[PDB]
Design a binder for this molecule. Sequence first.
Ligand SMILES: *[C@@H]1O[C@H](CO)[C@@H](O[C@@H]2O[C@H](CO[C@H]3O[C@H](CO)[C@@H](O)[C@H](O)[C@@H]3O)[C@@H](O)[C@H](O)[C@H]2NC(C)=O)[C@H](O)[C@H]1NC(C)=O
Lengths: 49, 49
Amino acid sequence: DNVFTFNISVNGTEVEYYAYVNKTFAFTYPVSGFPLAGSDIAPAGSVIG
Amino acid sequence: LSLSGNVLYAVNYPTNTKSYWMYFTVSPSSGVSSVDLSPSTTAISFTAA
Ligand SMILES: *[C@@H]1O[C@H](CO)[C@@H](O[C@@H]2O[C@H](CO[C@H]3O[C@H](CO)[C@@H](O)[C@H](O)[C@@H]3O)[C@@H](O)[C@H](O)[C@H]2NC(C)=O)[C@H](O)[C@H]1NC(C)=O
């Protein structure tokens, strides 16, 4: 299956993560203006990744 | 009788696993005559078919 990598920093140390992806899929997540956590509703003036 | 308000529905938001109440407002239609609403004489049915 498909693999890509990304780094995050933890205790100022780079940690590489390998992400394995079984099939093409999409997900959404809140970026700003989202108080409705739990709902799946994007309110007016929210920003969704 | 006329429906003379919005119909409001209450649930265990945001989890939406459980249903609490419905509220709505009624009034005699077009102001023409009075309506007996005694719970012995009147029925209210509810169906989610
Ligand atoms: C993301 O994290 C990686 C590991 O957490 C890190 O690789 C480690 O770094 C060195 C080798 O130098 C790398 O540097 C360049 C630029 O970052 C890379 O493009 C290149 O391919 C080298 O791998 C090494 O000590 C260590 O073993 C590496 N570990 C692994 C698992 O590769 C990356 O440097 C870091 N940044 C990027 C942009 O990938």
